[PDB]
Amino acid sequence: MKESLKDRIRLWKRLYVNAFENALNAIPNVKGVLLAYNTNIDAIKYLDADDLEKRVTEKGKEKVFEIIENPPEKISSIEELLGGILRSIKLGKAMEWFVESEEVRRYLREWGWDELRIGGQAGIMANLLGGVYRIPTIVHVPQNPKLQAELFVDGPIYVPVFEGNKLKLVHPKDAIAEEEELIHYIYEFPRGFQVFDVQAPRENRFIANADDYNARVYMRREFREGFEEITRNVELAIISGLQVLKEYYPDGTTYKDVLDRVESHLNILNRYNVKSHFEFAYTANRRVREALVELLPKFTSVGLNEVELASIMEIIGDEELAKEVLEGHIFSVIDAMNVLMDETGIERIHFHTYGYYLALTQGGGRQLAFVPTKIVASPKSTVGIGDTISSSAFVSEFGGGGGVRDALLFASLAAAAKAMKGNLERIEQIRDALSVPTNERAIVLEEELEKEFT
């Protein structure tokens, strides 16, 4: 090992422990955070071979196997549900089909699950920011039946309710309504799982989506009529869930009907100087993606990974640039972040990928911040890591905790801590991530940045 590397490793251990100190000291200063819009229920089933075989043969093995090779768009029958699961098994392929039959949804609910946890980017971040970081959190919950409300952890997590004409803020367990259970059913299977002659080449999972409301970005009445009163109780906002929007809907409505309401919400946030952070998850519809980019000028900040930034470069950059960004090639990423900032004028862009983060911020001049991350080799959990990274950096920077680079360092600590432990309960547990070595390949990659930019 070179002396310059050994010196850099020691420098980063220092910056990492200092950035953790700054984050613990500033997070208590955040008056409140608003999380919207997507909250649902995630039901996880660890598939059982004998159970699956018995259900396939119950419904007719022949037609179910026909469906494996002729897969439909949506689940319209129990046979299509089982055929889709076996297809995911045969291919070792992550798949998600929408359940458009109420009868299939009764079958799914009856079949059950092994564990139940909150889903949706606003839902899981309410448990992190409210439950773990102890930040007062207002979360949008489109439908809040008992099964949905109990998935929130204890802490300063709140939903708005109307006591006549006045808006109150209560824990979700105290605001249960006669509303729909929005369940995404997740069927996991290991490598080598076998059913009949079908054998998985990889571990993966098949998702049956039985959630009509988050698919339309449904906004509950408290958020459509009391948004201004809600805004007065928060300092920051994180917006997510718009990636599902379709160009057209069977009732004659379009994505514009939803984005118009989002735009009104942003206007209210900006009138109160609330800092907003948009999670720009992969948006399949290219027109909707273009409109989301046209909405970014009203956001304070936006976060994305290599796949999400490449997807955006497909509509405002060039094709070859997108491919380089997809592979995480750091100079093409930097160009892409400037292409995005030129197009929108947004104040802050946070890029995150395996090994390093980048933050491009605009002030009197554009500043670029770089951080090598802490990689857990065999993580106990990978769900919600990307949202954890993007939300943690935004909240600690705009909470005042040490600056931009330090906010990136805290997010890297939170990501590793979550990966090591599966699920966090208290923010002090993130100190354990200081034990994870910093990525040395990214540490030496910063040498290329200094030669090209100085």
Of 162, 197, 212, the last residue of a domain is 212
> Cα 90 vs. chain centroid, distance in angstroms?
28
Q: Are 71 and 13 in the same domain?
A: no
- Name the burial class of residue 103, with classes exposed (0-12), middle (13-18) and buried (19+) by CB atoms within 10 angstroms of its CB: exposed
Q: How far apart are CA 331 and CA 446, in angstroms?
A: 11
Q: How far apart are CA 82 and CA 79, in angstroms?
A: 5
Token couple for 95: 């798949």
Q: Are 364 and 430 in the same domain?
A: yes
Q: How far apart are CA 383 and CA 44, in angstroms?
A: 12
139 DSSP β-pair partners: 35
Q: How far apart are CA 20 and CA 390, in angstroms?
A: 16
Q: Are 66 and 24 in the same domain?
A: no
406 assigned to a ligand binding site: no
The set of residues, in sequence order, having a beta carbon less than 8 Å from that of 293 and lying 6+ positions away, is 312, 315, 316, 340, 343, 344
Of 196, 212, 228, the last residue of a domain is 212
Q: Are 203 and 245 in the same domain?
A: no
Q: For residue 232, which phi and psi values (nearest 5 degrees)?
A: -65, -10
Place of tokens 């070792």: 92
Q: How far apart are CA 242 and CA 280, in angstroms?
A: 8
**3-state SS assignment for residue 82:** helix
Known catalytic residue: 432? no
Please give the C-alpha separations between residue 200 and each of 57, 85, 299, in angstroms, as whole numbers. Answer: 19, 11, 43
Contact 313, 336 (CB under 8 A): yes
Going by their DSSP bridges, the two strands 204-210 and 183-189 should be labelled as antiparallel
Q: Are 29 and 131 in the same domain?
A: yes
Place of tokens 């892409």: 336
Range of the domain at 103: 40-119+181-212
40 assigned to a ligand binding site: no
Q: How far apart are CA 134 and CA 150, in angstroms?
A: 18
**3-state SS assignment for residue 154:** coil
Q: How far apart are CA 292 and CA 278, in angstroms?
A: 10
Q: For residue 136, which phi and psi values (nearest 5 degrees)?
A: -55, 120
Going by their DSSP bridges, the two strands 198-199 and 275-279 should be labelled as unpaired
Q: How far apart are CA 119 and CA 188, in angstroms?
A: 16
Q: Are 87 and 190 in the same domain?
A: yes
Q: Are 8 and 151 in the same domain?
A: yes
Q: Are 21 and 44 in the same domain?
A: no
First and final CA of the chain: distance in angstroms? 25
Q: Are 368 and 408 in the same domain?
A: yes
155 assigned to a ligand binding site: no
Contact 96, 125 (CB under 8 A): no
Q: Are 340 and 417 in the same domain?
A: yes
Token couple for 408: 């990136």
Q: How far apart are CA 76 and CA 210, in angstroms?
A: 11
Contact 281, 244 (CB under 8 A): no
The C-alpha angle with vertex 39 and arms to 184 and 37, in degrees rounded to 5, equals 130
171 assigned to a ligand binding site: no
Place of tokens 């600590």: 413
Reported as half-sphere exposure (CB side, CA atoms, 13 A), residue 129 has a value of 35
Q: Are 45 and 156 in the same domain?
A: no
Contact 175, 161 (CB under 8 A): yes
Contact 101, 75 (CB under 8 A): yes
> Cα 371 vs. chain centroid, distance in angstroms?
21
Q: Of these residues, 7, 114, 342, 387, which one is catalytic? A: 387
Contact 122, 35 (CB under 8 A): yes
Q: How far apart are CA 158 and CA 229, in angstroms?
A: 14
Q: How far apart are CA 325 and CA 316, in angstroms?
A: 13
Q: For residue 349, give the H/E element and its range.
A: strand 348-353
Contact 348, 367 (CB under 8 A): no
Q: Are 10 and 109 in the same domain?
A: no
> Which alpha helices (DSSP H) does 345-379 contain, by range?
none
57 assigned to a ligand binding site: no
> Which alpha helices (DSSP H) does 157-305 contain, by range?
221-225, 227-231, 255-271, 286-295
The size of the chain, in residues, is: 454
183 DSSP β-pair partners: 41, 210
**3-state SS assignment for residue 98:** strand
Q: For residue 30, which phi and psi values (nearest 5 degrees)?
A: -70, 120
Q: How many CB atoms lie within 10 A of CB 410?
A: 31
Place of tokens 């090639």: 329
DSSP state letters, 421-449: HSS--SGGGGGGGGGSPB-HHHHHHHHHH
Please give the C-alpha separations between residue 160 and each of 138, 166, 215, 237, 431, in angstroms, as whole numbers. Answer: 8, 10, 22, 15, 33
120 assigned to a ligand binding site: yes
Among left, alpha and beta (phi > 0; psi -120 to 50; other), residue 242 is alpha
Contact 124, 118 (CB under 8 A): yes
Token couple for 340: 């995005």
How many domains are there within the chain? 2
48 assigned to a ligand binding site: no
